[PDB]
Amino acid sequence: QESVKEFLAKAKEEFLKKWESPSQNTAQLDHFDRIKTLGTGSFGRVMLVKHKETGNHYAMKILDKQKVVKLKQIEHTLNEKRILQAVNFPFLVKLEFSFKDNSNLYMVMEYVPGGEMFSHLRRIGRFSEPHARFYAAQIVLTFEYLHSLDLIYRDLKPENLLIDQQGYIQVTDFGFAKRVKGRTWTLCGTPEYLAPEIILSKGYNKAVDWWALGVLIYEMAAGYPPFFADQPIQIYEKIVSGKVRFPSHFSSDLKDLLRNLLQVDLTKRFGNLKNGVNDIKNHKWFATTDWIAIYQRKVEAPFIPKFKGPGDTSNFDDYEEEEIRVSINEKCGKEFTEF
Ligand SMILES: O[C@H]1CN[C@H](c2nc(-c3cnccn3)no2)C1
Secondary structure, X not given: OHHHHHHHHHHHHHHHHHHHOOOOOOOOHHHEEEEEEEEEOOOEEEEEEEEOOOOOEEEEEXXXXXXXXXXXXXXXXXXXXXXXXXXXXXXXXXXXXXXXXXXXXXXXXXXXXXXXXXHHHHHHOOOOHHHHHHHHHHHHHHHHHHHHOOEEOOOOOHHHEEEOOOOOEEEOOOOOOEEOOOOEOOOOOOHHHOOHHHHOOOOEOOHHHHHHHHHHHHHHHHOOOOOOOOXXXXXXXXXXXXXXXXXXXXXXXXXXXXXXXXXXXXXXOXXXXXXXXXXXXXXXXXXXXXXXXXHOOOOXXXXXXXXXXXXXXXXXXXXXXXXXXXXXXXXXXXXXXXO
């Protein structure tokens, strides 16, 4: 374990150097051709773009400054970019460039053509336990890394887990990620994945990411989430009750791990005890997992996504194509000075 301790100490040193001196202004919009919209929301979208001189493909996240302000996301967007430019781990998407202009903020990431885990899960129905375990092990290692840097992730769900050309996970969307040493208070995350202490408006901590891992493992292995209901208020009532029903096809070891991750009392939840992540890594459900081989990407993946090359968009769906407009006047300059 000294080897793991020394790995995490170096990881934190390298993170802090970039965190204290963030990169800024490393590309500009007219260096890229726009290809296709890959998803869209209330203040932002992600496009496929191509760099004009190198020919490389990238995923460009575009945030409208005025809409970020109106929806009270200023601090969250500044967190997202400052964290992404400072992290480095095999299962995190890489930020390659960032910049801003009179109207928008831009984060240019590597493009992962294999698509969302969500699409693959919904197409096949559910994953076998070994398939769900391969992905879960990558999330355990990624959360061990992030939490040792004092980062909470706060947006785990199948749509944020991309499948790469080797069949491994790349986590994207750091819009709710935050550097936290103790407690934090903001209501954020998708309803089915929220821990009880978020729903109850408490000061909460990194144990909310371990709760969300329990929801993800359940949904991968069942094909639906554990607290499912028609509207959010009914979902929240089931979460806080914490009453969970498991399919009979679940192994006994899977049920035991999920009862310990989906523990309503945060002071009793796996990942948040004296032994930290090691209660999860040493659980019987993970007995066949070679943690070093997963980190080194030496395990054969269960599934390789079908795609034709680094520009193929067939694993993403279709959205109305809107302009990328840039005002002749600067908007919200003061709010986004540090970006
Ligand atoms: O609307 C949200 C959900 N789906 C969108 C999306 N994100 C990406 C992607 C691809 N490669 C690297 C990073 N992000 N593709 O689609 C974003």
